[PDB]
Design an enzyme around this catalytic site. Structure first.
Site, mmCIF file in Angstrom:
data_model
loop_
_atom_site.group_PDB
_atom_site.id
_atom_site.type_symbol
_atom_site.label_atom_id
_atom_site.label_comp_id
_atom_site.label_asym_id
_atom_site.label_seq_id
_atom_site.Cartn_x
_atom_site.Cartn_y
_atom_site.Cartn_z
ATOM 1 N N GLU A 1 -0.039 1.254 -5.875
ATOM 2 C CA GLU A 1 0.033 0.127 -4.958
ATOM 3 C C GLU A 1 0.053 -1.158 -5.773
ATOM 4 O O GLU A 1 -0.994 -1.607 -6.252
ATOM 5 C CB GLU A 1 -1.194 0.117 -4.035
ATOM 6 C CG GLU A 1 -1.542 1.451 -3.343
ATOM 7 C CD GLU A 1 -2.901 1.409 -2.637
ATOM 8 O OE1 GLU A 1 -3.439 2.485 -2.288
ATOM 9 O OE2 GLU A 1 -3.482 0.315 -2.445
ATOM 10 N N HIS B 1 0.850 -1.218 0.000
ATOM 11 C CA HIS B 1 0.000 0.000 0.000
ATOM 12 C C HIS B 1 0.888 1.273 0.000
ATOM 13 O O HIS B 1 0.837 2.089 0.922
ATOM 14 C CB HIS B 1 -0.958 -0.078 1.207
ATOM 15 C CG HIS B 1 -2.123 0.875 1.175
ATOM 16 N ND1 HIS B 1 -1.970 2.238 1.080
ATOM 17 C CD2 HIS B 1 -3.456 0.661 1.343
ATOM 18 C CE1 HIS B 1 -3.155 2.829 1.143
ATOM 19 N NE2 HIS B 1 -4.080 1.890 1.288
#
Ligand code: NA
Length: 287
Positions: free
Chosen positions: A263, A158
């Site tokens: 991500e 992330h």
């Protein structure tokens, strides 16, 4: 050099101590990466680094579910983005002095107790973090330690990249790729030559290979490059004004202007790993 404390591990590059990475043992969360003194990742000024909740910034780790699942008996019991980012990982030690490389591990026995009871699947995770003079590599290996059951999971890094101004930023090398738009709830091809920003965005690009580097550009300069291996999806996210206001640990509220999440992951479907088998991938950040 590598330096371990109770809460974190810090790597500094032997050729230049101002190049560094800080990794919180909680979530095995990279929360700072400095390249010659310059911070490359965005971290909320109100981020918790104390293990009370996931870190808002850096590189939270997403496993075994991306987003909130509704239909799998067990995965549907977990909170958004799983249990890797709210479990305290074990520092396994250094594997290299140059480039400074370390490993972190997680297994049900040491993972978040509440969440492990909800999703009691056997697995072993090994995260390897490598600090180059001009790059940061975060690699992951997942092993299905069951002898009878397949292990079904997503994996995502992330990554919060730090930028100067979202509105003047563009992202290149995704032209013509298929995406799923999480906000509109529809799939379509991105026909634009670059990605530009003027509102909340939450899209999942698909079929991104090791050959397709993604660039983040500001004032004509490539300020970040993202490469990956074995992670065919890329989530592009910025919360914008309203979502930022609502995130309690997100500060300043204008902070969406200094971040873009790009991500890499395997999230379009689940990886199904046979007993005893291993899966591995990595992302590689540079300038
Ligand atoms: Na707040």
């Amino acid at each position: 050099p590598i330096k371990e404390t109770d809460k974190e591990v810090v790597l500094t590059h032997p050729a230049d101590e101002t190049t560094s990475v800080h990794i919180l043992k909680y979530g095995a969360t990279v929360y700072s990466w400095k390249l010659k003194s310059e911070e490359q990742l965005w971290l909320s000024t109100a981020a918790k680094l104390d293990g009370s909740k996931p870190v808002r910034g850096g590189i939270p780790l997403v496993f075994p579910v991306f987003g909130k699942n509704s239909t799998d008996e067990h995965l549907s019991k977990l909170p958004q983005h799983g249990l890797a980012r709210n479990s305290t990982w074990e520092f396994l030690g250094q594997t290299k002095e140059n480039p400074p490389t370390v490993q972190f591990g997680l297994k049900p026995e040491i993972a978040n107790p509440e969440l492990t009871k909800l999703w009691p699947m056997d697995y072993l995770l090994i995260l390897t973090v490598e600090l180059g003079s001009d790059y940061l590599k975060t690699a992951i290996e997942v092993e299905n330690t069951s002898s009878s059951k397949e292990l079904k999971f997503n994996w995502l890094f992330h990554t919060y990249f730090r930028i100067e101004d979202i509105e003047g930023t563009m992202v290149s090398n995704l032209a013509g790729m298929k995406l799923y738009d999480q906000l509109l709830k529809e799939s379509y091809v991105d026909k634009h030559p670059v990605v530009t920003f003027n509102q909340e965005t939450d899209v999942i690009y698909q079929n991104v290979s090791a050959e397709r580097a993604i660039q983040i550009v500001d004032k004509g300069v490539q300020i970040h490059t993202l490469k990956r291996y074995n992670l065919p999806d890329t989530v592009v996210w910025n919360p914008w004004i309203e979502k930022s206001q609502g995130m309690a640990d997100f500060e300043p509220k204008t902070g969406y202007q200094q971040m873009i999440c790009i991500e890499p992951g395997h999230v379009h479907d689940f990886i199904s790993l046979a007993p005893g088998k291993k899966w591995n991938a990595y992302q590689l950040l540079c300038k």
